[PDB]
Amino acid sequence: QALEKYSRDLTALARAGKLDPVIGRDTEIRRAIQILSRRTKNNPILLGDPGVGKTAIVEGLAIKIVQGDVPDSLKGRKLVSLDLSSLIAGAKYRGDFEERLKSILKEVQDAEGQVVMFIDEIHTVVGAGAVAEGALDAGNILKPMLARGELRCIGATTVSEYRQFIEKDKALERRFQQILVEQPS
DSSP, X not given: OOTTTTEEXXXXXXXXXXXXXXXXXXXXXXXHHHHHTXXXXXXXXXXXXXXXXXXXXXXXHHHHHXXXXXXTTTTTOEEEEEOHHHHHHHOOSHHHHHHHHHHHHHHHHHTTTSEEEEETXXXXXXXXXXXXXXXXXXXXXXXXXXXXXXXXXEEEEOHHHHHHHTTTOHHHHHHEEXXXXXXXX
């Protein structure tokens, strides 16, 4: 709330048997877990073309969490996927857009690491120019939060978009660990 409105709860979906089995991704999922367990460089970012099924890896992580197959750092966590398009479409002015986004993210922060957030197309929230001037830019809120390590976050994007919008930003580069997803599975 409005986290519930503007996110999909992957851990809840996992518990209901609503996520498809993920095969051939044990290594990638294990790596994401290791990354999420670290002090600073602890935001895994899945890189690969759309056709490799990056979201499935996040769904696999949700599955592992709910069966308790994770370190103390992730035991009992809720894993949510942020729905930015719905937030953008539902707002018209910068003020209330940012207030609603801050409200969602404060709820995550107040959970003090009990909530992990997946952000797909993450280059679109880093305030590096993917969002048009004059358009509603989540980067105003998410760039500083991510750069300061205020979120437990998994991201996804393409290699080229990562290199364009995230690479060269030393603050984000420091926080993120790339996981290359080479082939569909």
